[PDB]
Design a protein around this ligand. Structure first.
Ligand SMILES: COc1cc(-c2cncc(-c3ccc(C4CCN(C)CC4)cc3)c2C)cc(OC)c1OC
Ligand SMILES: COc1cc(-c2cncc(-c3ccc(C4CCN(C)CC4)cc3)c2C)cc(OC)c1OC
Ligand SMILES: COc1cc(-c2cncc(-c3ccc(C4CCN(C)CC4)cc3)c2C)cc(OC)c1OC
Ligand SMILES: COc1cc(-c2cncc(-c3ccc(C4CCN(C)CC4)cc3)c2C)cc(OC)c1OC
Lengths: 279, 284
């Protein structure tokens, strides 16, 4: 029998320090192909090792197809999501109560699935690089979490999204729950980025990245540590949110993701429960 | 062109399957790992992410749809098969014998030795040397295969690994210094010694040759257990017998001395891969 391994690379949909992502084709079907830079080689090994241990299958987790090493090119092949990243989608799109709640509930579902140990099954997983660029929008209005390059099974990540215990290096490195709590911090920021683009009473905010008003682009560790750890600043909740019951509930939720004390933050399971009681 | 055609299965076992295949009109070997051996696939893939006497890497693939995963390793194909196979129905002369064993020594020295620069390699202990893990090339030289238990140094945890028949005494009595990289290189030399013995037996001298036998064929039951090997190697302190006819031949007399120096109970007493390459280089 023949093994069709011809993956056609059609257009580049992303370039960065990580390498490149390509819309590709395998046997008619659209696939996404990540070509790892030498800089990010370790991420391919971490992610391949994870999927060699547990084959994750969840509607809110970017779907694995293949990990390939060729003579050295390192490739990750996934399902393709033509709508692109939540980051990209939020720039050009506003949301209503239904689309906003569908997006944030699907992210919480995907994250709770990563975090939970299932017996029989999967180990518990912390993502450690959650951000709006690492979330993709599906045609059914749900999202999926992508990029398990830094994932841990039971510092690193995007500086703008790092929890204060990461920035001030007080994180208990030998405690798995520490890495879950770092994920909730970043989830709280993503929730803020999405809520801003939900219309209420004819009002919406601009797309802005977290801490857009207090740090430059490509903020330094020191920039982030001063804002988040020393000054203990948190993203602004606009007045207009408190005229909307959904945005009022989401504001309370994001505050409970942003405590300086990691152990005080909500769990993914508790956020999922709270979000189902909202509308 | 990435289209791989699977033509014939050349091997099946606990490890999975191996297949002769086609890929851009060239012959390739395709190992499909068993779910038992999934850690070996990942370990081998990290090793190969770094020579004429190491099985040549082409690709490594993890593929999945739903709950089903396939692990592939694609390498160059060697028509003449494993040294194990080759020694079954072939006898050797001085020239063939030395070329085989010098090539294996060369590969193992290359694995064992750290090279520096941007084009280099760490030091590697193989940990699973046997005649089935060596392949015969058409130029009569060999290459070492199966880096799935290999260990790098600039660790590899779990138990008591390798092929029982080739396990060193420190592996069988489990006194091996698990944190010591040199221990693992020394395990290789033991196993290499047993491979020298398998090969030397098939070299004709003065019109005499021994038939093919695996190490300890005569002293353990067929399909020996870990305990069976421990008894003969550790308790009885047995080593493969040197046929007296070898002592009439200068080459086999030198090879007998070499394999004795691979078989010390003291690992530190054993020769290094490099010393073996140099001694074998001096024999003619
Ligand atoms: C190696 O590489 C790639 C391969 C493929 C690919 C193409 N056709 C068929 C397959 C296949 C899957 C699974 C089995 C099973 C059948 C049952 N049997 C008991 C065990 C094995 C056989 C064949 C694959 C894996 C796609 C790829 O890309 C999406 C690959 O990566 C480039
Ligand atoms: C984050 O991480 C990974 C993501 C993906 C991935 C999967 N589907 C679609 C996309 C995508 C497509 C298109 C746009 C843009 C550009 C085109 N224009 C029309 C607007 C839209 C953005 C994004 C991506 C980036 C794959 C990965 O691996 C193969 C990733 O790494 C794990
Ligand atoms: C990696 O990705 C894709 C792979 C394939 C694909 C191609 N040939 C054969 C297979 C296959 C057949 C049968 C089994 C099972 C059957 C039950 N039991 C006996 C174990 C073996 C597994 C696998 C697959 C999954 C198709 C895809 O899409 C159409 C893939 O996605 C791009
Ligand atoms: C040990 O290890 C690996 C080996 C190989 C490999 C490479 N060339 C040729 C072979 C071969 C071909 C054919 C025979 C035949 C000979 C005659 N016949 C009656 C019985 C058997 C045996 C051996 C193999 C097995 C590939 C591997 O991976 C892709 C290996 O794993 C790393």
């Amino acid at each position: 029998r023949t093994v069709a391994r011809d993956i056609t690379l059609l257009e580049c949909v992303g370039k960065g320090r990580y390498g490149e992502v390509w819309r590709g084709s395998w046997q008619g079907e659209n696939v996404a192909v990540k070509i790892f830079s030498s800089r990010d080689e370790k991420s391919w090994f971490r992610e391949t090792e994870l999927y060699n241990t547990v084959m994750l299958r969840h509607e809110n987790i970017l779907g694995f197809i293949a990990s390939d090493m060729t003579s050295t090119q390192l490739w990750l092949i996934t399902h393709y999501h033509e709508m692109g990243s939540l980051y990209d989608y939020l720039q050009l799109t506003t949301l209503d109560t239904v689309s906003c709640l569908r997006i944030v509930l699907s992210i919480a579902s995907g994250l709770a699935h990563l975090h939970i140990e299932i017996f029989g099954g999967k180990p518990a997983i912390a993502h450690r690089d959650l951000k709006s660029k690492n979330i993709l929008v599906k045609k059914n209005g749900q999202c999926c979490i992508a990029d398990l390059g830094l994932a841990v099974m039971h510092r690193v990540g995007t500086k703008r999204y790092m929890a204060p215990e990461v920035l001030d290096e007080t994180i208990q490195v030998d405690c798995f729950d520490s890495y879950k709590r770092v994920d909730i911090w970043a989830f709280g920021l993503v929730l803020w980025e999405v809520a801003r683009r939900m219309v209420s009473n004819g009002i919406v905010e601009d797309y802005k990245p977290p801490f857009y008003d207090v740090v430059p682009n490509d903020p330094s560790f020191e920039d982030m540590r001063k804002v988040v750890c020393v000054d203990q600043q948190r993203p602004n909740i606009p007045n207009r949110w408190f005229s909307d019951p959904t945005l009022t509930s989401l504001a309370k939720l994001m505050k409970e993701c942003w405590y300086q004390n990691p152990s005080a933050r909500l769990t993914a399971l508790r956020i999922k429960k709270t979000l189902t009681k909202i509308d």
